Amino acid sequence: KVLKIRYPDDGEWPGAPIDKDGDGNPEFYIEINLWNILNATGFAEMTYNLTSGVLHYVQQLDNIVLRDRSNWVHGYPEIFYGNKPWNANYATDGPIPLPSKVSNLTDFYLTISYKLEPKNGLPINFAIESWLTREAWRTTGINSDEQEVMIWIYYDGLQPAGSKVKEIVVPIIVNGTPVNATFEVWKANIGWEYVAFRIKTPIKEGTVTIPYGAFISVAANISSLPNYTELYLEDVEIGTEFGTPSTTSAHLEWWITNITLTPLDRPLIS
Ligand SMILES: [Ca+2]
Ligand SMILES: [Ca+2]
């Protein structure tokens, strides 16, 4: 039927597996993940139609107070594949064997169909994220010698952490058209190493395809981390960070109607 998770009714941390064939190995995992909201009024609800495959998120939050203003954004309601290292949730029923070492993975395309409707000027992005960890099956967080990589294919009013390194051009596909797209590369120290690729021409809705290794190769190339090839690419998460400390009302709706990961016959790291 329809899988539904809701904040605050299901608790602090609503989330659920998507396990179509009931094999106890989910294909994807969804979380509302309001991880820097200490208190708010209102609600956020995510539903997944097990027939149409449509994930739909509706958020009407007000009177927001953050856990830690220095963490900047409010949360990252999302769907992911792989092992998310901040908790015991995972989804590994898919064609890409995450978690695996970067040095052992082949490249893959990530294709997402979506439509974003932030309301009232709300700062948001639509960002794909992966964590790279010393341990494949981490469930308790991230250490200072590990990495977070984000790829922002939409943003309005939000800036990545840290500082701008350079611009790169990556061949991507936008609504069926091959596009050589420019991304700004940003790098931060926030408790671990962070690298974000923020596209220069953000895409508010449609179907976007990226070659994942174009981004992980650059993140490897610019890393300050030692023994980068020891790292496991844990997962691929897709969601919307939203809000800054200026934001006390965050009303947002979106839909993601397909996620596909397509293996390629070439290494991840070029
Ligand atoms: Ca399954
Ligand atoms: Ca709003």
Numbering used by the authors: 50 to 319
Kindly provide excerpts from the paper associated with this entry.
The hyperthermophilic glycoside hydrolase family endocellulase 12 from the archaeon Pyrococcus furiosus (EGPf; Gene ID PF0854; EC 3.2.1.4) catalyzes the hydrolytic cleavage of the β-1,4-glucosidic linkage in β-glucan in lignocellulose biomass. The hyperthermophilic archaea Pyrococcus horikoshii and P. furiosus have glycoside hydrolase (GH) family 5 (EGPh) and family 12 endocellulases (EGPf), respectively. The optimal and denaturing temperatures of EGPh are 100 and 103°C, respectively, and those of EGPf are 100 and 112°C, respectively. EGPf appears to be a secretory enzyme because of its signal sequence at the N-terminus.
Here, we describe a new crystal form of EGPf prepared at pH 5.5 and compare it with the previously solved EGPf structure. Based on initial screening results, high-quality crystals of EGPfΔN30 were obtained using a reservoir solution consisting of 100 mM CHC (2:3:4 citric acid:HEPES:CHES) buffer pH 5.5, 200 mM lithium sulfate, 5%(v/v) ethanol at 22°C. The average size of each crystal was about 0.7 × 0.5 × 0.3 mm after one week. This was a new crystal form with symmetry consistent with space group C2 that diffracted to 1.68 Å resolution. The final model contains two monomer molecules with 270 amino-acid residues each. pH5.5, poor electron density was observed for the loop regions of B3–A5 (Gly131–Asp156), B5–B6 (Thr182–Asp194) and α-helix–B4 (Ser272–Glu283), but the regions were interpretable. Comparison of the structures at pH 5.5 and 9.0 showed that the structures of both main chains are the same. Comparison of the EGPf structures obtained at pH 9.0 and pH 5.5 reveals a significant conformational difference at the active centre and in the surface loops. Glu178 seems to play a role in controlling the optimum pH of the enzymatic activity. In conclusion, crystal packing is weaker and the quality of the EGPfΔN30 crystal at pH 5.5 is lower than at pH 9.0 because of the flexible interfaces 1′ and 4′.
